[PDB]
Amino acid sequence: AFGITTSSSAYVIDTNAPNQLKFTVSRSSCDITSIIHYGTELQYSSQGSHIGSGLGSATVTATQSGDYIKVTCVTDTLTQYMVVHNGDPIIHMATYITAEPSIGELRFIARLNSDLLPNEEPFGDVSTTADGTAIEGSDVFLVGSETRSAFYSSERFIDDQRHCIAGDAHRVCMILNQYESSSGGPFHRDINSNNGGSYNALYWYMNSGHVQTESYRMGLHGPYSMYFSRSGTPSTSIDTSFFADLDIKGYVAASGRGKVAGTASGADSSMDWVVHWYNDAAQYWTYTSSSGSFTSPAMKPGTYTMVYYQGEYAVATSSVTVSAGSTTTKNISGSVKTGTTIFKIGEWDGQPTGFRNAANQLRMHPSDSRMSSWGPLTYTVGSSALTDFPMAVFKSVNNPVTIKFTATSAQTGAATLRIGTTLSFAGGRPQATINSYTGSAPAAPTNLDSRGVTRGAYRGLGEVYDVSIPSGTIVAGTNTITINVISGSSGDTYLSPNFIFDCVELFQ
Ligand SMILES: C[C@@H]1O[C@@H](O[C@@H]2[C@H](O)[C@@H](O)[C@@H](O[C@H]3[C@H](O[C@@H]4[C@H](O)[C@@H](O)[C@@H](O[C@H]5[C@H](O[C@@H]6[C@H](O)[C@@H](O)[C@@H](O)O[C@@H]6C(=O)O)O[C@@H](C)[C@H](O)[C@H]5O)O[C@@H]4C(=O)O)O[C@@H](C)[C@H](O)[C@H]3O)O[C@@H]2C(=O)O)[C@H](O)[C@H](O)[C@H]1O
Ligand SMILES: [Ca+2]
């Protein structure tokens, strides 16, 4: 039956789902210590499923409100909520914080039986580190001859409404339709799952210091939903609006929200367009249609910075105010301006898209034998393919990048060499030589104090480095550009100072 079974040490919540879902919540710690789905225990028995590594101690209450059961766990700065609906094999959750946890990240982790749930979806065994030997920190492993990381399960938050772990008789998915309290914007990615040897971990990283570009946000994180299937795959259309009736702290209901609608225009139409709104309280985003039309998700009232991307490259920024119960009509337009192009390597999309190893980097370590050579490589404009240009240059792996290009006598005037990047590590930034002419050393970029390129990430601050080339420095015939990554810092191989490339353009 749908209901709560109480003992001194626990509440057993029964969702009354057709294929059975009961779970045990510790009244002392708020740990999920047992999960029975279709007569089968799914929960790792040594460690609970919980926020972080455990709340440790919490004040726990359970109540029925009609066809809903709510479990509340209170700590000093964090309230954890679990809500179930009669008939549904889902643990709905929401996490209310007034401060960032001590550890400096906010995650939920489900620690589940890896024999029954060995697989990871949608990306496969790339995040299975079981039987792996660490090759970097304690988060990148070698399994046989293949490199592996929990990070290789990651996905841009804008595209991460569902990820799961699974076996032949059970599937457990995270359903994620509310990223408003997270940090890093639409292109932030994070750890999703990890079969690490003892159990298979399923996550939602509400926030983290993994390639973090923003301050943390307080208030209610989620709702998020952990779905339990036999062999089905749950839709991402899961109604959580019943949270409005359960006095969830920090919860703002539909009627407390407003929107922004309009049309974005002017950007590169070969790319997906994204509109992004943020302030200290909340962040929202949406893809636009191919005509540029957009309607924001339901937004908390307030004033927001509004950004228009082609790919992950901001072409315009603006400000907008949202009122509860109304739609603010707000258009946005803009484009990337350069000049008359001599050559262009890659595209202005805020990604290493198309470069050598770009597709692999998301799902493996740069040391992986399946990677193509890092170089040093000479890219000759007109003969070399884009997949011959390294996605990253490391001070101590493939430094420098040499570019060969032909110019006509009509192209010997003043130019700007533009070096567009996505993300830096250890102070990495480019200094350019063109023929016998050396550009200035730019100052160190902001340090994000995080590995990235070795952990499947590329979305950083997107620094752009322009070099003014005087007239008559470019010559008719062959020319040479040397891109050196400079930095006062030092490191072994892929942890040496580096940056990931976005686009390299020479224009007049
Ligand atoms: C090469 C490396 O580079 C630099 O590294 C720093 C930093 O020193 C390093 O720890 C790493 O930090 C990030 C990291 O993020 C990951 C997870 O989000 C985090 O929860 C953690 O996960 C582990 C965790 O285990 C718990 C506990 O830590 C264990 O000791 C044990 O008790 O079990 C606990 C448990 O909950 O089970 O959770 C497990 C489920 C998981 O399996 C564990 O991996 O670590 C992850 C990781 O990537 O290592 O940790 C958080 C707290 C931090 O905020 C992140 O920055 O990466 C940093 C960086 O990239 O800069 C340093 O130079 C370092 O010395 C060097 O070795
Ligand atoms: Ca690019």
Swiss-Prot record:
**What protein name is recorded for this chain?**
Rhamnogalacturonate lyase A
For the keyword Ligase, the answer is no
GO cellular component, as recorded: extracellular region
Q: Which reaction does it catalyse?
A: Endotype eliminative cleavage of L-alpha-rhamnopyranosyl-(1->4)-alpha-D-galactopyranosyluronic acid bonds of rhamnogalacturonan I domains in ramified hairy regions of pectin leaving L-rhamnopyranose at the reducing end and 4-deoxy-4,5-unsaturated D-galactopyranosyluronic acid at the non-reducing end
The record's disulfide annotation reads: 30-73, 164-173
Q: Which molecular function terms from Gene Ontology are attached?
A: carbohydrate binding; rhamnogalacturonan endolyase activity
Identify the glycosylated residues.
Answer: 331
SUPFAM superfamilies reported in the protein's UniProt record: Galactose mutarotase-like, Galactose-binding domain-like, Starch-binding domain-like
Q: What class of enzyme is it?
A: lyase
Q: Which PANTHER family match?
A: RHAMNOGALACTURONATE LYASE-RELATED
Task: Explain the purpose of this protein.
Answer: Pectinolytic enzyme that has a positive effect in the apple hot-mash liquefaction process. This endolyase hydrolyzes the alpha-L-rhamnopyranosyl-(1,4)-alpha-D-galacturonopyranosyl glycosidic linkage by beta-elimination, thereby generating oligosaccharides terminating at the non-reducing end with a hex-4-enopyranosyluronic acid residue.
Activity versus temperature? Optimum temperature is 50 degrees Celsius.
| Activity-pH dependence | Optimum pH is 6.0, enzymatic activity becomes unstable below this value.
Among InterPro entries, the record links this protein to: Carb-bd-like_fold, Gal_mutarotase_sf_dom, Galactose-bd-like_sf, GH-type_carb-bd, RG-lyase_II, RG-lyase_III, Rhamnogalacturonase_B, RhgB_N
